[PDB]
Design a protein around this ligand. Sequence first.
Ligand SMILES: Cc1noc(NS(=O)(=O)c2ccc(NCc3cnc4nc(N)[nH]c(=O)c4n3)cc2)c1C
Ligand SMILES: Cc1noc(NS(=O)(=O)c2ccc(NCc3cnc4nc(N)[nH]c(=O)c4n3)cc2)c1C
Lengths: 252, 257
Amino acid sequence: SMHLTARGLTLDLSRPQVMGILNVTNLDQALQHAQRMLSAGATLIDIGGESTEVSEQEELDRVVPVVEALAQRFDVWLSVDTSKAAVITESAHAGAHLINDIRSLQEPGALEAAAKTGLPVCLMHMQPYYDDLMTDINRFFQHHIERCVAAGIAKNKLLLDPGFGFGKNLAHNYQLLAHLSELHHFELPLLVGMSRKSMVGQLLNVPPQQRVIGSVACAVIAAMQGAQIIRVHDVKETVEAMCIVEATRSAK
Amino acid sequence: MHLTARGLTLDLSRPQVMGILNVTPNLDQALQHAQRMLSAGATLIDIGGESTRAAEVSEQEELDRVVPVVEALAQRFDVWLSVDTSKAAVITESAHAGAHLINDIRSLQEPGALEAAAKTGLPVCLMHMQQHSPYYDDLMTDINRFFQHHIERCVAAGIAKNKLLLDPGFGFGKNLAHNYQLLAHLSELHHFELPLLVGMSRKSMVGQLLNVPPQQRVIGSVACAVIAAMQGAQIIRVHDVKETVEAMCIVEATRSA
Ligand SMILES: Cc1noc(NS(=O)(=O)c2ccc(NCc3cnc4nc(N)[nH]c(=O)c4n3)cc2)c1C
Ligand SMILES: Cc1noc(NS(=O)(=O)c2ccc(NCc3cnc4nc(N)[nH]c(=O)c4n3)cc2)c1C
């Protein structure tokens, strides 16, 4: 029904999009891994310097060369998983397409830097107790959506992530997964990250490397509920699953 | 509710995985594979002496493949045993061996099949079917009319309504568009108030989309299983049990939330 655009490049959101995770914790490995994910069918590459502290220069040193190298190398959406205004701006210079912040630009100067770039930004819900899980998330997004538009970032440039595994217990996560379709009322793209998280592990009683099937199953359930972007470790498997999903949905 | 045979119950509040146990071109290997699938979490084992994908099979030949396996499993394991047969002789003999469920793609239309199946008193699964290019005026209506027709045949024959299972038959006289049309509208078949069994594992509906060989169709098959189970499909017929079982755990947890 819709699409999102950056730097003359467009991301089709009528179909589920797979975002490959590229955590940095060697430049050569990063470029090659990105290549592996891209061929696997990823339409976005997410570069993250923190795992949910890191120094500003240290985080910048890891992130921006990878962004620039990929920007030169491939015509693909580039996303930086950062919460730092310096990293926001520097990545924009490097050629990043999307700003993905788990802290929702609440760090000092982060909001202004993001606004100046004009790049699309993804807002993620974060805190364990909830009176009503879904209501809290809806209220959270509404607040920062109000804030983002106020900052001069257009509403249609925003993405929403309910933030699986962030200040949420096992029951909450699957409650969220079950009611995920409700979040579409914002008429904004939904991005979800469930890959290899505890919500899979606790159920299957398997280590992270054995959580591929569980992660994909979650991705399929989310995508069947209209989730547009899926953030995963295992791109190829997720891409294959999304093909089944898209064929099913297109079949009406 | 549950499905019942010989004092065994199958919980239908949760998705059940039926492991595929083909016995075609050693009993020892079959038992190891079945036990492995059993270990993976399968609650049903489907034993087939015929290939529905094919050269025909003799009555004695199919019997030779099927019944020793059924007898072997019945003693060794407490699991639902399903026989994938269209032959009254195989139906009757397998029932003697201790089979719990009759899975017939041809819906008991072979000679004497209906009568033989009825006498066993065992639950039966009916499957919709149609070189010919698959066409439907309306796929779901055609399937609904098919099930309505054969359900009456079974009931008239003396097979109780609660003993019946319905399979829309993925990949049987259906093209790629048809199969996913069926998957999308699968929930509609619940109106018969009968358990639904689906078989999409490693089938062309996955293969044509991903363009990979059968052994590499695991993820696609699991994706189909999840979608079907989310639409309330009770029994899933798969080659890869462990992966499907893990997926069903995510599905059941999601629904139970
Ligand atoms: C220790 C320890 N390690 O993991 C856990 N448990 S956990 O639920 O699986 C878990 C929770 C969170 C994460 N963060 C990973 C992560 C990173 N970036 C993201 N960006 C976006 N936009 N959306 C996301 O969802 C997201 N998630 C990784 C693992 C414990 C406890
Ligand atoms: C030849 C040839 N080989 O594969 C194809 N394409 S196919 O769609 O993948 C395909 C089609 C049918 C099968 N038969 C396998 C099979 C056997 N018994 C079943 N019993 C039940 N209850 N339900 C089932 O779905 C089912 N499926 C296996 C593969 C053709 C055509």
